[PDB]
């Protein structure tokens, strides 16, 4: 759970609190890219929006609907030894918090919903591009009229259609009146705790940017109805959403290694150091996005951004010795101390000062075929690199790796600017 809050803590209780959730299925990237964009690019000025950007991360990492079954059928009867039992309890606790008023759950769904059977793509059994409630009213909720909230939100989405076929309609599933499947899903649990709960589905027939667009329209429409004031730092249109999803300023940081850009990495990174005795899902990972993770695939470790594969790591597992904190490097003529885990920009040249017991291997540079080299004490310029060893497709970014005995002391990247 990530809080989207006012900068002043006093303003939290001055408007309602919304819980926003996506990614209960790992192959519905519209939802979890929209929660990501929301987290990265919006501000909430009063009240609070609590966000779980992906409910089923393990499934997301394998581009899979659900590795342990349908997580959205686990809100009623559920076996205590179900692998997702603890996750479900966490989600139910968030939903049931007294401080929460409304819940919004994002999905991607096949085709386009219609109240009347039009054809196999457009009928009441399809889920695409609709806004969903379990009933018209929840007695005892701060905002009991779900139908009014739903219809006004739908108005707001329909003011921005990209094509008429994408028109949004209300789907009231009347869950208590015998809908067995919806009776086991998230939003029904929510209304039973007297929350106004809503679901948005964007059609899978749409490309990602358009799915996300529609999810963000639904979020904005509902926030407007709740009177949770907000801003965003961009114009909401498919192109602006596409640019923010595919944003070259996104980065990820694995363990104590340097920040690396997410987009335009070489597809495979060889001889890549990862801590030994650490399970892949436990390896610390940091990003300015919220849907990034690592996942083991055969012998490789994939870097994932939602359902996108950003690079394949071919790792070697090694002890990460934290003793080395900084290194004396000459950067464009100027000796300075560079902290392990930095990215340093280089206009012309660099040189690493020799160290007692620490050897440095600059990936892409070499003077011999020794497989465990020490390349401290060489003046290195762009011309000295074999470009194919770069981290990036643009051939500007290179790894410098430091070793002490059979331990890994850290990495610095150089970027030629
Ligand atoms: N396509 C979704 C609709 C569920 C909508 C709502 N009941 C929720 O829990 O968000 C499903 O079949 O799980
Ligand atoms: Ca209206
Ligand atoms: Ca995708
Ligand atoms: Zn080298
Ligand atoms: Zn080696």
CB 373 within 8 A of CB 392: no
The CB density around residue 296, as the number of other CB atoms within 10 Å, is 14
Q: Any binding-site annotation on 212?
A: no
H helices present in 319-401, as ranges: none
Q: Is 126 in the pocket of ligand 1 (CB under 6 A)?
A: no
Q: Is 109 in the pocket of ligand 1 (CB under 6 A)?
A: yes
Q: Any binding-site annotation on 79?
A: yes
Technique behind this structure?
X-ray
Q: Is 55 in the pocket of ligand 1 (CB under 6 A)?
A: no
Q: Any binding-site annotation on 25?
A: yes
Q: Any binding-site annotation on 277?
A: no
The CB density around residue 257, as the number of other CB atoms within 10 Å, is 21
Q: Is 132 in the pocket of ligand 1 (CB under 6 A)?
A: yes
Residues 6+ away with beta carbon under 8 Å from 246: 263
Residues 6+ away with beta carbon under 8 Å from 365: 375, 378, 380, 384, 385, 386, 398
Atom 12 in ligand 1: residue holding the nearest Cα: 182
CB 222 within 8 A of CB 17: no
The CB density around residue 111, as the number of other CB atoms within 10 Å, is 19
Residues 6+ away with beta carbon under 8 Å from 35: 20, 21, 22, 23, 51, 52, 53, 54, 106, 290, 291
Ligand 1 pocket mutation, candidates 130, 187, 195, 203, criterion most atoms within 8 A of CB: 187
Q: Is 185 in the pocket of ligand 1 (CB under 6 A)?
A: yes
Ligand 1 pocket mutation, candidates 73, 107, 190, 215, criterion most atoms within 8 A of CB: 107
Going through 292-376 in order, the beta strands assigned E by DSSP cover 292-297, 300-305, 308-320, 326-331, 334-339, 343-346, 349-352, 359-362
Domain ranges of the chain: 1-249, 250-321, 322-417
For 188, list phi and psi in degrees, rounded to 5.
Answer: -65, -45
How many angstroms separate the alpha carbon of residue 30 from the centre of ligand 3? 8
How many angstroms separate the alpha carbon of residue 322 from the centre of ligand 4? 22
Give me the residues paired with residue 104 across strands: 20, 198
What is the per-residue burial (b if ≥16 Cβ within 10 Å, else e) of 114-148? beeeeeeeeeeebbbbbbbbbeeebeebeeeebee
Nearest ligand 1 atom to alpha carbon 185: 9
How many angstroms separate the alpha carbon of residue 393 from the centre of ligand 5? 24
Residues 6+ away with beta carbon under 8 Å from 178: none
Nearest ligand to residue 386 Cα: 4
**Helix 208-226 and helix 238-245, axial crossing angle in degrees, nearest 10:** 110
Extract the tokens encoding 100.
């929460």
Alpha carbons 164 and 178: distance in angstroms, whole number: 33
Q: Is 72 in the pocket of ligand 1 (CB under 6 A)?
A: yes
Residues 6+ away with beta carbon under 8 Å from 69: 82, 84
Alpha carbons 101 and 124: distance in angstroms, whole number: 29
Q: How many CA atoms lie within 13 A of 267 on its CB side?
A: 0
* C-alpha R_g of the chain: 25
Extract the tokens encoding 31.
């939802």
Alpha carbons 397 and 117: distance in angstroms, whole number: 56
Alpha carbons 305 and 250: distance in angstroms, whole number: 10
How many angstroms separate the alpha carbon of residue 107 from the centre of ligand 1? 7
């Amino acid at each position: 759970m990530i809080e989207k809050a006012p900068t002043n803590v006093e303003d939290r209780d001055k408007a309602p609190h919304l819980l926003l959730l996506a990614g209960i299925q790992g192959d519905e990237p519209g939802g979890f890219n929209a929660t990501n964009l929301f987290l990265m690019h919006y501000s909430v000025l009063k009240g609070l929006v609590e966000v779980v950007p992906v409910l089923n991360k393990p499934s997301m990492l394998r581009n899979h609907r659900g590795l342990y079954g349908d997580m959205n059928r686990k809100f009623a009867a559920l076996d205590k030894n179900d692998p997702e039992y603890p996750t479900i309890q966490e989600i139910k606790s968030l939903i049931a918090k007294p401080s929460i008023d409304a819940v919004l759950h994002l999905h991607d769904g096949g085709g386009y919903y219609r109240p009347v059977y039009v054809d196999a793509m457009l009928n009441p059994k399809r889920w695409g591009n609709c806004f969903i409630i379990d009933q018209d009213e929840v007695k005892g909720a701060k905002f009991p009229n779900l139908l009014a909230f739903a219809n006004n939100t739908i108005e707001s989405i329909n003011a921005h259609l990209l094509h008429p076929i994408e028109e949004y309609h209300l789907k009231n599933t009347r869950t208590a009146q015998g809908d067995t499947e919806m009776q086991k899903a998230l939003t029904f649990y929510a209304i039973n705790q007297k929350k106004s709960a809503f679901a948005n589905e964007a059609s899978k027939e749409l490309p990602l940017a358009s799915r996300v667009f529609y999810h963000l329209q639904a979020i904005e429409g509902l926030l407007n109805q709740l009177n949770i004031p907000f801003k965003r730092d961009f114009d909401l249109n498919p192109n602006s959403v596409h640019a923010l999803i595919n944003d070259k300023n996104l980065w990820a940081k694995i363990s104590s290694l340097p920040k690396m850009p997410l987009f335009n990495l070489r597809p495979k990174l060889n001889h890549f150091p990862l801590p030994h005795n650490t399970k892949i899902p436990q390896i610390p990972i940091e990003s300015n996005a919220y849907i990034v993770g690592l996942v083991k695939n055969k012998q490789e470790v994939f870097l994932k951004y939602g359902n996108k594969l950003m690079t394949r790591l071919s790792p070697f597992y090694i002890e990460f010795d934290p003793s080395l904190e900084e290194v004396k490097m000459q950067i464009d003529n100027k000796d300075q101390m560079v902290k392990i885990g930095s990215v340093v920009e280089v206009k012309e040249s660099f040189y690493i000062h020799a160290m007692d017991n620490i050897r440095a291997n600059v990936i892409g540079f070499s003077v011999s075929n020794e497989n465990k080299p020490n390349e401290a004490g060489y003046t290195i310029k762009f011309k000295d690199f074999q470009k194919r060893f770069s981290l990036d497709k643009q051939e500007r970014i290179y790894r410098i790796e430091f070793y002490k005995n059979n331990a890994f002391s850290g990495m610095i990247l150089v970027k030629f600017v």
